[PDB]
Amino acid sequence: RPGLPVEYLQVPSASMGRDIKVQFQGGGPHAVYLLDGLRAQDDYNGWDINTPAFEEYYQSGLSVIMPVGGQSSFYTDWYQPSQSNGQNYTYKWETFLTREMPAWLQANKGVSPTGNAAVGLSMSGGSALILAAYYPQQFPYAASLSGFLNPSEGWWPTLIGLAMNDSGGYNANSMWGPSSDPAWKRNDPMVQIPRLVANNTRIWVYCGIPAKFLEGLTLRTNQTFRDTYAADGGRNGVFNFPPNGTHSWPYWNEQLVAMKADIQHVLNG
Secondary structure (H helix, E strand, C coil): CCCCCCEEEEEEECCCCEEEEEEEECCCCCEEEECCCCCCCCCCCHHHHHCCHHHHHCCCCCEEEEECCCCCCCCCECCCCCHHHCCCCCCEHHHHHHHHHHHHHHHHHCCCCCCCEEEEECHHHHHHHHHHHHCCCCCCEEEEECCCCCCCCCCHHHHHHHHHHHCCCCCHHHHHCCCCCHHHHHCCCCCCHHHHHHCCCEEEEECCCCHHHHHHHHHHHHHHHHHHHHHCCCCCEEEECCCCCCCCHHHHHHHHHHCHHHHHHHHHC
């Protein structure tokens, strides 16, 4: 029974000055990092609350890592605490995911710090792509399921700010500064397409004010990302835009299952 039982771990974060809970299933030296959505809770990762992800990846030859917490964090290193909502520390989730957590998992379990997959949805879809863009040795594979693919452009900084405020009262200004700050472009998957191409990252991209207007913005940004990836010489992407696909856990799970063979072949093949 490889990797069982599912474990709940306490992993210290020096950068955040606290312990981060991590749900973990073993089964191989390489791992799928399953990142949570905008409303990430402090008890369980949304993948475990809403999907059979652990069971689906049981005996896949891959470990599964579900970090817990980080509501509205975008899994990034923030400039400062979100003072607005009383946050008493600075989110440093990029530091945690790229240094602190892999060091702990390597030392204690033998999970490789390199050759892994980052899989994100909603808020963390972009995160996964950005992690692969800047840390290609750690993440030769990244999936973005309904992610914000061009967060620095047009309506997106405003919409992201509003979403973060609605999800725990977090302040985008404290995260990446005003939309004019270099951090917005740094953390914009569209802008970092040349890195994804140069790194030959295997990317898996899914997607499904008035709703119609939002849908229009989303459709256009997604098409632009896909087109720009192709134009920039990208040749290692899967783009899934099925008409009946939705922005929900059941279809995010469908995509997680669909990509399993893909991840196995890239990471273990």
